Amino acid sequence: TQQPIVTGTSVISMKYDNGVIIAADNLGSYGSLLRFNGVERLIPVGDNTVVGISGDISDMQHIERLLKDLVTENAYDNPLADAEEALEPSYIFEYLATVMYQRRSKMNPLWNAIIVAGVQSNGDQFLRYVNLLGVTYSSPTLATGFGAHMANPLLRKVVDRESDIPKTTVQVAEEAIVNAMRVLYYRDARSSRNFSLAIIDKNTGLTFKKNLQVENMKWDFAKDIKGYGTQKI
Template structure:
């Protein structure tokens, strides 16, 4: 068998003669068939978000993992768009960078003929849903899960999800990655149904998000204790907080565990 990446698994030329490459490249100018990324390499983990009566709170940590290696510790995965919207992205970092450039281009194009109307969360979500579904239909998906949050055209909180297949849904609390298993149960204790949103203030929503980020740091091996948090309200617009810490000296309890370090059991 051949072990060259472009000839992988083909019978040996010595046994069956030289492979006819013109068959594989019929109608193509390039030297080998077009290949698409089918597996994320550097990835970001959970994005979590919650609605409250005046807006939304969304958070994501700053880690880019190269497999199991915590390689990059300053990756920003929250992107404000317009005056009242934010996009949080998990998954492949290279595809995340591509999506962020699409959002920048969309914002620039919208500002060329500014008529007093800015991009809002529903417009951005609909655009991303079309992009993700289009790429999925080409069998070249963007390996990301995305949460779009902000205010809708009437000024009410908006929170919606879209993934690499173009699947979309809305809920008062959303999470991607391991956050869907570890953070959502905590957030749903605060806001379970849409009718509960009106009972929740900003401080309660922020505290729930901070608690979730701490739990994710402890329980998700691909997470970091440094994260970014964005709060969006009609009154204050987008408030972007960077470099937040889940908890100081997070592993201080380890010294009390028997068998840890130099302790004797």
């Protein structure tokens, strides 16, 4: 028994040819109050993994602490902690999925939807979702909350199946993500103009971009709209 209090809306993500992209806005909502504005909802783990979290922010802060403990604990008595025995995205994911499912089974969930994005040591892209029920799935595109309803359809127009992924460049993928963040800001009442974005490339590594803004917004057409039916002036 519980209920989310301070919350953070969509996390959206996709695969491109050489890695993964993930983004989330910087807002912590308090019901319909847009209460906190500098909230990082992307969490780098090592330098091959970004965990994107939506839902309850207190539970998000708990999952942060767990992920940092995991890095510490992996480094213990491990001379290959920054090489062959570094934490892989799949390890980080399975761990969280275990936690999530155990917590729902005890009737005390972590009130979150989580996307783990990264690149494996064999160069393979990793993109997987887990939520408060312990439900897990993978897809060329993943999104939580509103993002599932609005971002996925736009992202899927780019990567509709597995074979579309060699064909998709960094530039096209980031372009699609950035556009989808704009659409979310247009239609999601709990979204923010400011967001963070992270690229995990098999060649580049980790690029973490903060303080990004939605630009090129269309508002001019508003002026022609008068009334709600018959009103002329």
